[PDB]
């Protein structure tokens, strides 16, 4: 139980959500940016702190 | 601790034929032996309870019998429905034990495959990997050989997979996956999938020379 | 109607601890003894615990006693299993089955199962890749599209096509491991009309990382 972030992703093709447990929120998108990379997601990276969620939109 | 011993263990039967399954308790369980059916990955369903009662939705083709130590399940007419595993349990006394399961494979007419190859995804490449895939579907006999010849030369970084029999139309399917790097797949160009099956003398063969548009 | 559904599974560390649950509905929870029954990658069922209707009487399999504790909240109808020394061999598919009343002295009703994996490995979600045919008249009348679900661990992953409105010619191929990461495929073959016309979406779930992602499959249109 370290700190669980979530990535909602609405790309052109891949719409959905994944998750990760991290230290820093800053940590969270470093692996998220990687996860989006691997899946071919490229876009606008916003972020909600009350909800601990990164968004990746195309 | 009662020990439930299931035999044969595996058996293949053409449809409309009879089959018999044996359950053996280590010591008396009177009639407290039930049989469950677990169709290709589904959880188990109750099938026979007591040693001889049919449960909700089992046709009189199924018949269970047995007494203290020896139980048997008789499919009088094997069918495509019946494709599954049959586990047997005794609920006489704790610990409650199951037998090992008996797999029932449907024997049937040979059927040649449908081979499709699919080239790596733009997305796949974005990350620097290239995974080439070929789907050989709905055959019968599960014996098949896929050969991956690169330009028109062959490998080893394949990874194959096989299905359980389709339950309706008693066939199998397969998927071989060739995964090279970006800069590997790259420095190469025609990509083939070759497959002989005893329905064909002549390998079945899947194509594709990289036309990247 | 009797429906049973367990939750709480995922990856655990050897030596660890987890709590499975089972929601009973459409039947009078509390008139029945409940059971836990798990199943490994090879085997058949293995019984784990029993709890009498009122929690007064419980029974354990030798393997799991001193470590697992069965419980139940009749009031809000759910059965439970507190596991506590996870060893690699506690790795199975866990189900909750209902005992049943005479004549049925059989595992009446079964849940769907909740898988639990005990391992040191880190949880890795999957990379979903389309398998587009795109431009090669490939038919009988049928086109064959798929999805590639590579790089995950643990198991399982669940592929459905169009939130399942395509039970049509679906084929999911079991996962093979490469290096602590499984990779599995899923095909569906549709007629010619629809490949592009109609969207074909593969749904992918990976509970351990709670990934639920849809990958629209579009002609790789050159």
**Nearest C-alpha neighbor of A30 from the set A20, A40, A16:** A20
What's the CA gap between C196 and C135, in Å, rounded? Answer: 12
What's the CA gap between C97 and B33, in Å, rounded? Answer: 16
Chain centroid, CA B102 distance in Å: 13
**Which H, E and C letters describe B182-209, residue by residue?**
HHHHCCCCECEEEEEECCEEEEEEECCE
State the DSSP code for C31: G
Q: Pairing relation of β-strands C109-110 and C92-98?
A: antiparallel
Residue B107 CB neighbours (<10 A): 14
Beta bridge partners of C19: C82
Q: Is A37 on the interface with B (CB under 8 A)?
A: yes
Chain A residues within 8 A of C151 when measuring between CB atoms: 38
Total tally of structural domains belonging to chain A: 1
CB C60 within 8 A of CB C48: yes
Q: What share of chain C is helix, strand, coil (3-state, %, to 5)?
A: 5, 50, 40
What's the CA gap between C172 and B22, in Å, rounded? Answer: 32
Q: Is B55 helix (H, G, I), strand (E, B) or coil?
A: coil
| CATH domain C1-121 topology | Immunoglobulin-like (2.60.40)
Chain B residues within 8 A of A39 when measuring between CB atoms: 123
What's the CA gap between B162 and B172, in Å, rounded? Answer: 7
CB C147 within 8 A of CB C215: yes
CB interface of C with A, residues 141-200, below 8 Å: 151
Domain spans in chain C, listed from the N-terminal domain onward: 1-121, 122-222
Beta bridge partners of C129: C148
Beta strands, E only, A1-58? 4-10, 14-21, 44-48, 53-57
B125, containing H or E segment: helix B122-126
Which ranges of A1-58 would DSSP assign to H, the alpha helix? 25-38
Q: Is C83 helix (H, G, I), strand (E, B) or coil?
A: strand
What's the CA gap between C129 and A39, in Å, rounded? Answer: 7
CB B49 within 8 A of CB B55: yes
State the DSSP code for B123: H
What's the CA gap between C210 and C203, in Å, rounded? Answer: 13
Q: Pairing relation of β-strands B103-107 and C127-131?
A: unpaired
The subunits that touch chain B, with at least 3 C-beta pairs less than 8 Å apart, are A, C
Q: Pairing relation of β-strands C158-161 and C142-152?
A: unpaired
CB B189 within 8 A of CB B212: no
Beta bridge partners of C213: A16, C204
| Domains annotated on chain B, with CATH | 1-108 (2.60.40.10), 109-210 (2.60.40.10)
Query: Cis peptide before B8, with omega less than 30 degrees from 0?
Result: yes
What's the CA gap between C17 and C8, in Å, rounded? Answer: 11
Burial of A22 from C-beta contacts in 10 A (0-12 / 13-18 / 19+): middle
Resolution (A): 2.6
The answer to whether B98 contacts C173, with C-beta atoms less than 8 Å apart, is no
| CATH domain C122-222 topology | Immunoglobulin-like (2.60.40)
Measured in degrees and rounded to the nearest 5, phi and psi for residue C28 equal -80, 80
Residue A4 is part of a domain; what is its CATH number?
3.10.20.10
B-chain residue closest to A13, CA distance: B123
């Amino acid at each position: 139980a370290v700190t669980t972030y979530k990535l909602v992703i609405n790309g052109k093709t891949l719409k959905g959500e994944t998750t990760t447990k991290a230290v820093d929120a800053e940590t969270a998108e470093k692996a998220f940016k990687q996860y989006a990379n691997d899946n071919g997601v490229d876009g606008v990276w916003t972020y909600d702190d009350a909800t601990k969620t990164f968004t990746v939109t195309e | 601790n009662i020990v439930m011993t299931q035999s044969p263990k595996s058996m293949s039967m053409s449809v409309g034929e009879r089959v018999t399954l044996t359950c053996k308790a280590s010591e008396n369980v009177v009639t407290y032996v039930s049989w469950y059916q677990q169709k290709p990955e589904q959880s188990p369903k109750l099938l026979i309870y007591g040693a001889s009662n049919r449960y909700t939705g089992v046709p009189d083709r199924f018949t269970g019998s047995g007494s203290a130590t020896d139980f048997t399940l008789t499919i009088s007419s094997v069918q495509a429905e019946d494709l599954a595993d049959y586990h047997c349990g005794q609920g006489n006394s704790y610990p409650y034990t199951f037998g090992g399961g008996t797999k029932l494979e449907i024997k049937r007419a040979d059927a040649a495959p449908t081979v499709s190859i699919f080239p790596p995804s733009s997305e796949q490449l974005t990350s620097g990997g290239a995974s080439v895939v070929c789907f050989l579907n709905n055959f019968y006999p599960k014996d098949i050989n896929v050969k991956w010849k690169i330009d028109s030369e062959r490998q080893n970084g394949v990874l194959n997979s096989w299905t359980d029999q389709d339950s309706k139309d008693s066939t199998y399917s397969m998927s071989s996956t060739l995964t090279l790097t970006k800069d590997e797949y790259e420095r190469h160009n025609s990509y083939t999938c070759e497959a002989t099956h005893k329905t064909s003398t002549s390998p079945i063969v899947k194509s594709f020379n990289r036309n990247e548009c | 109607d009797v429906q049973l559904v367990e939750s709480g599974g995922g990856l655990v560390q050897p030596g660890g601890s987890r709590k499975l649950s089972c929601a009973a509905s459409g039947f009078t929870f509390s008139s029945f003894g409940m059971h836990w029954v798990r199943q490994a990658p090879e085997k058949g069922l293995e019984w784990v615990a029993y709890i009498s209707s009122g929690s007064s009487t419980l029974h354990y399999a030798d393997t799991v006693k001193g470590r697992f504790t069965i419980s139940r909240d009749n009031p809000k109808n759910t059965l439970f299993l507190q596991m506590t020394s996870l060893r690699s061999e506690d790795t199975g598919m866990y189900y909750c089955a209902r005992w049943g009343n005479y004549p049925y002295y059989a595992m009446d009703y079964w849940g769907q199962g909740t898988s639990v994996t005990v391992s040191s490995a880190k949880t890795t979600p999957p990379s979903v890749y389309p398998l587009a045919p795109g431009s090669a008249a490939q038919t009988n009348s049928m086109v064959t599209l798929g999805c590639l679900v590579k790089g995950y661990f643990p198991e399982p992953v669940t592929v459905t096509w169009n939130s399942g409105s395509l039970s049509s010619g679906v084929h999911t191929f079991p996962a093979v491991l490469q290096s602590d990461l499984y990779t599995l495929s899923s095909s569906v073959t549709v007629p010619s009309s629809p490949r592009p016309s109609e969207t074909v979406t593969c749904n992918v779930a990976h509970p351990a990382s709670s990934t639920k992602v849809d990958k629209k499959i579009v002609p790789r249109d050159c």
